[PDB]
Design a protein around this ligand. Structure first.
Ligand SMILES: [Ca+2]
Ligand SMILES: [Ca+2]
Lengths: 487, 498
């Protein structure tokens, strides 16, 4: 070989060079994840905008309408799709970006409901639905809600991108980004399998038309519809060396818009913020065999919903689904659901959590790992740096439980006693430089938590790194822009 | 004490122990700046929220109303105020975070003008004042503007904090923060002297009620009112080892809300972004003898306005004021005004500027140092790393001039010809690894720039570091979280129990 005298000895891999091999954890269990490895030349694409991305996913069969909406045949053949630069998913069929005003003008919000701007719609929506005008007994209805729903439906059809079988999305270099939308891994009618996503910065899956639900959590909540990645109908998915965050638009910049105080509730409080985000990566329903490795997740509220309902059932509360492995990740400035686990067997090892509890911070820590209904969590050699005022961090800050005895009983009728157990194990947890017994914290949180009856080593091999210098190692190697150097 | 700038980070002072000595540059000239050094024990405080901070500044004489507004007597006696953790300034008298809807509901925006929401006010404001409706021939007026002004006035009275004479604000440890407001060094009714501010991370002085001025720059601009620190009525001020930024609300998140073309102008352009920030540290009017040393300034548009008007005058365009020294700072991801200098004798030495011209960046570089009206700029051994995908950076990207001869002649009648000159000197400037002659660029920018007739070494002693390793040195050593080690964890009463 030949090393040039002016070559850089410390350069990362060439831009555009990574492949799709290397999956670990549950994604590798039983049958391997390979994504689009081996793709024909004609299914090896470099894409730089939403239209090109869609044509790659659809094998050039897509008709992309003027609104950006898609008709075509998703391509199930192996494909390698390299992401060049920034792809804004919130653009129309001519690549012109949407704005909230455009979603109003281009949808039935204007053509049926008469709105001349998003600012007008928003003002009317707040006047109609604020707690002191609408109350909390029923969901919202009427003209401003119908108009919002028109605009939201158009946005859904634009920012949601369906990913088919045997697909690799591989960012190029240090500046591959996918903004403002939601990769959807499978649908009820068309589940998918075998997907690899690497080296991309995902940012700000912003719902421009969040709905107020007066009945949510008794007092009401704003809810949004878009994750960065939704895994509801996909199996064997490897998400590796990506970065995910709320980007330019952090939640505290969109505070409560209510100012009344009624029934003892100060509606200007932060619980009533206008939440424009949903999950980073949510694994629900028949999502299964997913590994999230070596990612940088930061600056976001509700990070990972694993299982979306306490209600046991074959479709949405199934203890045979939702097998997820998290390792080598940096969980930074996340408030909660890191991860929140119902029904699935979830392994978290060698991750680095970093945040503060301070209430004035950008995304104050609320909860770490949550053992939810019939979740089965196994945690090894995770390190947590959790700052905060008043007192030292404690294990109960980092793990808790949310379990219903009634739902466990319902579960046992549909699935077995072992399948319905809610269990938690940890070893090697470090909190602010000292040992932390997360299992004791979980037991304190709920006496319903039971003895673990699975372990991940029975399902896949792995390596546990020591915790001593793990935070530094993860900070240096995790996320997008590490596997390759700049283009 | 004295923590050398190139000392071992492991030898940093114990948390909560740094003092107020070390001022250099113009802040060291005349009666040296000491802040609250030597303060009585009864004027030594540790504060953790807006109410505590105000009581310390006011010597426990403040009455803080439910809305957060303040009455009382700022305390001129020497005081040392240590910042424990994060202080959010955008909160009411109960420490409840404000929202724009609260400001509308709790001000004359609602009680006089009848606005039931921020959404309604904003919708009316855009409808009334967009260029296609209002034009550009006059400033805004009428109901939505008066309602905005009501809400903005209440926010001003909450987020602006008066700092009196002989005050030190000293962050504890590596995580002292002050968010969402504006330290005001002196007020017109009560100017002050002798203030030291160290070891604090300042973020995001955000104005929830920016004003559209149709006449600004002829086509119009959105303008906001809050700096992180304003120095209009203070002399002898040392701002050292702090970090300043727009926090996590970068300007990029708030683009133009206009979508029309009027008189040939595409009003969706970036010129017309809804700017919620103003300066990082602005020194205007009678601000004088200020040194900013060893700070990290990052992620912000208009960084330092030194002198707010071209018009000469004893009040606001006074060439006997505005003496400012900047040294050892990291100026990272700042767009412009780094620094923009009118009227004052301003020395910038051994700073590291770091940015890109890439137009897709959050704060793409527009301008570096500006010789403004009657400014007297002296720049030595500054390093600039200025990237960009389009073309190499040039000296002309790093220094420019904004001078009017008519104003120069007006000035001489109030002051003198020498005091009214606009002058620029540089030596040792490095741009992207090679020397850059900024003075030559300034001369091409304006033929009205004149020969320098002052030098800072006449007024204080200083040693210039070489530029060779300066970028690395400054990156490693500047800002908050360097002077002190981290705070020890707070004790639990449980630890006493065996
Ligand atoms: Ca979701
Ligand atoms: Ca200012």
């Amino acid at each position: 070989m030949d090393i040039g005298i002016n070559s850089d000895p410390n350069s990362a891999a060439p831009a555009g060079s990574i492949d799709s091999l290397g999956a670990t954890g549950w994604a590798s269990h039983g049958t391997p994840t390979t994504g689009g490895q081996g793709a024909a030349a004609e299914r090896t694409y470099t894409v730089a905008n939403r239209n090109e991305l869609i044509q790659a996913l659809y094998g050039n069969t897509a008709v992309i309408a003027p609104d950006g909406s898609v008709q075509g045949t998703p391509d199930k053949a192996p494909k390698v799709i390299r992401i060049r630069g920034t792809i804004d998913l919130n653009v129309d069929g001519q690549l012109r970006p949407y704005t909230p005003d455009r979603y109003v003008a281009g949808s039935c919000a204007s053509s049926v409901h008469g709105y001349a701007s998003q600012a007008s719609l928003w003002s009317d929506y707040l006047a109609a639905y604020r707690p002191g005008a609408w109350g909390n007994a029923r969901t919202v209805s009427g003209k401003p809600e119908d108009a919002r729903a028109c605009a939201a439906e158009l946005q859904r059809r634009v920012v949601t991108i369906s990913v088919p079988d045997n697909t690799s999305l591989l960012g190029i270099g240090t500046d591959a980004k996918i903004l403002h939308g939601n990769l959807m891994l499978g649908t009820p009618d068309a589940p998918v399998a075998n997907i690899v996503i690497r080296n991309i910065t995902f940012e700000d899956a912003f719902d421009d038309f969040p709905q107020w639900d007066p009945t949510d959590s008794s007092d009401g909540r704003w809810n949004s519809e878009y994750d960065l990645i939704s895994v509801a109908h996909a199996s064997h998915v490897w998400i590796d060396h990506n970065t995910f965050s709320d980007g330019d638009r952090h939640d505290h910049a969109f505070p409560s818009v209510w100012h009344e105080t009624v029934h003892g509730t100060d509606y200007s409080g932060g619980d009533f913020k206008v939440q424009h985000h949903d999950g980073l990566v949510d694994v629900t329903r028949h999502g299964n065999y997913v590994t999230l490795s070596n990612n940088h997740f930061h600056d976001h509220d509700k990070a990972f919903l694993i299982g979306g309902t306490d209600v046991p059932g074959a479709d949405s509360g199934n203890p045979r689904m939702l097998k997820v492995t998290f390792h080598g990740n940096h969980f930074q400035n996340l408030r909660q659901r890191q991860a929140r686990v119902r029904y699935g067997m979830v392994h978290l090892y060698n991750n680095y959590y970093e945040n503060t509890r301070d209430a004035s911070a950008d995304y104050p820590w609320l909860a770490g790992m949550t053992l939810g209904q019939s979740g089965k969590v196994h945690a090894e050699n995770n390190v947590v740096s959790l700052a905060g005022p008043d007192r030292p961090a404690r294990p109960a800050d980092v793990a808790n439980a949310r379990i219903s005895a009634a739902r466990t009983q319902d579960c046992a009728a549909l699935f077995s006693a072992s399948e319905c157990a809610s269990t938690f194990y940890d070893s090697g947890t470090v909190l602010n430089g000292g040992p932390a017994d997360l299992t004791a914290a979980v037991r304190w949180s709920s006496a319903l938590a039971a003895a673990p009856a699975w372990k991940p080593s029975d399902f896949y091999d792995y390596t546990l790194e020591d915790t001593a210098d793990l935070a530094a190692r993860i900070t240096a190697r995790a996320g997008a822009g590490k596997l390759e150097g700049p283009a």
